[PDB]
Design a protein around this ligand. Structure first.
Ligand SMILES: CCCCCCCCCCCCO[C@@H]1O[C@H](CO)[C@@H](O[C@H]2O[C@H](CO)[C@@H](O)[C@H](O)[C@H]2O)[C@H](O)[C@H]1O
Ligand SMILES: CCCCCCCCCCCCO[C@@H]1O[C@H](CO)[C@@H](O[C@H]2O[C@H](CO)[C@@H](O)[C@H](O)[C@H]2O)[C@H](O)[C@H]1O
Lengths: 35, 50, 307, 37, 50, 307, 37, 35, 50, 50
């Protein structure tokens, strides 16, 4: 239990890393229609 | 009981995911579909010309 | 300065064009609005572009009820003048002394608030970019500066990177000596121009880091992360799927809100558009809907427009 | 007291100028570092 | 000083001329650089009336 | 009662179907909503109709967030049951003893408010129409009625006219004797069914007069005028332009507000719809946007649906 | 006093019933009037 | 100068008569596309 | 009276059965009068999963 | 002066009429246009069949 400013820092950093891996990964390509 | 809380939680989450998916996908689905129809029309006019 | 010519360095984009792909092209924060709106632009000529635009809005706080804007753009000079209901006149003027160097002016009058005008000078060399923009300059009786001044620099250390900074010095009155805030800037473009990274550590302690990726020619994606003791930050991931008939944009925020913007060209002239924003944490919605007519002014452009 | 704040902001601006000069120098230094390896 | 009064006066003049007269000047530049040179009604009317 | 058979009188519509054309078919007050909404109905069978509907809404006060409704309708019995978030269950049941006579029930439970259920009996003869609907009946200890009772009658004096009345008697508790309010009713259908007039002078002093006109097969128009010392009345003129792909409805009110409702069928399944309301006197807007999916439940209806 | 209100509402309902009966009679009377001219 | 309840009565009656004549008149027909 | 208690009791019973059990009864009538008689998941799922 | 009031009044009225006409006519215009296109498609498929 922290609920301190480093909490939102770490949470937004985690969302960032997750989104970058989602974007950079093959899964994002699947979201692109072939046409 | 705990089971009654689980139904509420899961149902609210399903609601959010569903309405999110609708808003984000249905306009896009119709955009993609209109573009598919346009490609199809162009293909038909191309085959008829040749 | 000879094996400088050896490196084959490329000019980086302006400091304003740093997060251009994520913040503007992909995301919809600029594009998003609320309530009904209609836009009526008509183009009178095209070799030097000249066009006049009417804008009707209702249901939002930002947009005015009627706004008439008119721009002229010849080969090196751009001038736009805008009149709004309650007579708030905004005028911008770019003049290109050369393709690289430009000198510009932005003047805004609010008819009840202090007038704000900014003089900017943007010069882009072979391997770096400079700008200097001064907002409301004035000299006290002692000869001391009074206003805001923003000087930014950006250099390509290697054909992919671009490191730089922007220095803001602001002095309001002269009684209190003005304060200075420095911000650092980083861009990294991929080898094949597939993806871009862009990070800026502002002077207020804030950090903004963003990534852009091009999955294919018709599709794009991008994530952004802002944060500003009292810390708070928002993360947004979004995608743009553009086609010939339409342009779709979706966005998913860490504040629990989702957003959508569709611009659907239906006629050669008319284009409808929709925008929808849900906020889950407080369970409500913003809908904006609107349209754009474009009309040719002269007969020749009117025949060019349809076919 | 305001003289100290003026001095501090002046120092900040001088520092920024020095950083810009270092960045202008930086491509040559980077390439010389790459040349070393 | 007298120079302060003079600069303030011409700034007042320039501010007035820019507030009242910026957008008509833009429109005149346009109307000059067109080949057709339409009238003032058509210049403001949103229609394709040509 | 022989030269009664001579007249060739025709049954008039129910008292509920009096202003049906103006208030419901043409106008959009029933249809209009606010905020985003999505509807998902799926049909499992068609000889006896059975279908289940989901409804998601956000941005309005009337509509709930999730509502599941299911109806069954065989040749003479209709039953609909509806469950809403916060568990407000509404159920209606029509049973046709014959094509003319029907006996129906409506039961609504609000989980925190008094339950309200109404028993109605509607009988339509060759040349008149009766209904008797009783809301929350109950008998005091003395044997006296306690509830609301509405008995209405409508008779065709000539094949175009239909004069009638409805009597409402309401007794809340028994301490105060209940009150009675009578209302009179008039309908006039044209010779060629082109236009209809409909006027009702309610028991509260109010007057509602409406006209409907059919300009062509695809287009309709209608005006309505309501008014209720403290008098206040609103006039509304509107039009419905229906086509095979779409249904348009426009409305212009005396309170200074304009309204629009477009239901655009885009797929054989999906149908988008838009609704927009401007109010000029206080200069604001309501936008609602939404959609309807209809899906077949079994394979046969799924092939019937597309083709 | 409440007896007077009960009587008044009862009178209103009886009146409504009489009006309904008159309306049922009305087509014949209307046609006989048209028959006279 | 009345600004009395009969004002809104007369105003809504006037809008009614005007709308009926607009509807009943040929002008409403013109608002119907031929197709 | 005892008759008052009895009518109140059976009204409570009927109200409960109608609140808890009206819409499942509608769904059972449906599931009876279909030729396919789908399962309970498909009966509630909005999809065309058939 | 009185002329300055007339401009305000007429401009506000023109604004209301314009936005009203847009909201009431543009969705209808697009509805009618889609229906025209559909009639045209049916005519083309009819002439090609015969
Ligand atoms: C202040 C004034 C406010 C004015 C507000 C008006 C807003 C109106 C917005 C909703 C209007 C509905 O607009 C809707 O747009 C869609 C695209 O989405 C159009 O769809 C279009 O695409 C198809 C694609 O083949 C074409 O055949 C055709 O050009 C057209 O039908 C519909 O014809 C129209 O029904
Ligand atoms: C709680 C969830 C909320 C979900 C909210 C979602 C609301 C979305 C509404 C706006 C969506 C845009 O919907 C728009 O509809 C128009 C009609 O007007 C469709 O237009 C349609 O008509 C043309 C006519 O030829 C067809 O080719 C095709 O079926 C389609 O293009 C567009 O394809 C779509 O762009």
């Amino acid at each position: 239990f922290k609920e301190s400013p480093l909490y939102t820092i770490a949470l937004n950093g985690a969302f960032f890393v997750a989104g970058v891996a989602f974007i950079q990964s093959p899964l994002m390509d699947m979201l692109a229609p072939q046409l | 009981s705990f089971v009654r809380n689980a139904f509420t939680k899961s149902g609210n989450l399903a609601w959010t995911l569903t309405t999110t998916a609708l808003l984000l996908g249905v306009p896009l689905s119709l955009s993609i579909l209109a573009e598919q129809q346009l490609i199809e029309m162009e293909k038909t006019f191309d085959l008829q010309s040749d | 300065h000879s094996h400088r010519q050896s490196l084959e360095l490329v000019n980086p984009g302006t400091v304003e064009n740093l997060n251009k792909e994520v913040s503007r092209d992909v995301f919809l924060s600029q594009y998003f609005f609320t309530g009904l709106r209609a836009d009526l632009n008509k183009a009178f000529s095209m070799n030097p572009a000249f066009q006049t635009s009417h804008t009707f809005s209702i249901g939002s706080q930002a947009l005015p009820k009627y706004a008439f804007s008119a721009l002229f753009a010849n080969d090196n000079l751009f001038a736009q003048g805008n009149i709004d209901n309650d007579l708030s006149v905004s005028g911008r003027l770019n003049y290109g002394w050369d393709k690289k160097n430009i000198s510009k002016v932005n003047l805004q009058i609010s008819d009840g608030q202090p007038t704000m005008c900014q003089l900017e000078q943007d010069y882009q060399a072979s391997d770096f970019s400079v700008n200097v923009k001064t907002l409301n300059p004035s000299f006290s009786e002692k000869g001391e500066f009074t206003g805001v001044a923003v000087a930014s620099f950006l250099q390509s250390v290697t054909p992919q990177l671009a490191l730089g900074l922007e220095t803001l010095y602001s002095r309001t009155d002269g009684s209190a000596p003005g304060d200075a805030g420095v911000s650092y800037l980083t861009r990294y473009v991929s080898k094949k121009q597939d993806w871009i990274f862009s990070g800026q550590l502002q002077a207020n302690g804030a950090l903004i880091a963003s990534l852009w990726r091009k999955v294919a020619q018709n599709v794009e994606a991008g994530i952004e992360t802002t944060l500003q003791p009292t810390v708070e930050g928002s993360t947004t991931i979004g995608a743009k799927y553009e086609y010939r008939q339409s342009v779709y944009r979706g966005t998913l925020d860490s504040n629990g809100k989702v957003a959508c913007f569709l611009e659907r060209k239906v006629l050669p002239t008319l284009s409808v558009l929709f925008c929808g924003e849900i906020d889950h944490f407080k369970n409500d919605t913003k809908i904006g809907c609107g349209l754009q007519f474009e009309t040719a002014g002269n007969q020749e452009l009117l025949m060019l427009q349809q076919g | 007291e305001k003289r100290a704040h003026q001095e501090q902001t002046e120092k900040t601006l001088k520092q920024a100028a020095y950083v810009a000069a270092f960045l202008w120098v930086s491509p040559m230094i980077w390439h010389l570092v790459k040349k070393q390896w | 000083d007298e120079s302060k009064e003079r600069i303030s006066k011409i700034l007042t003049l320039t501010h007035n001329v820019a507030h009242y007269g910026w957008i008509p000047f833009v429109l005149y530049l346009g109307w000059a650089h067109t080949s057709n040179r339409p009238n003032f009604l058509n210049l403001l009317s949103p229609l394709p009336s040509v």
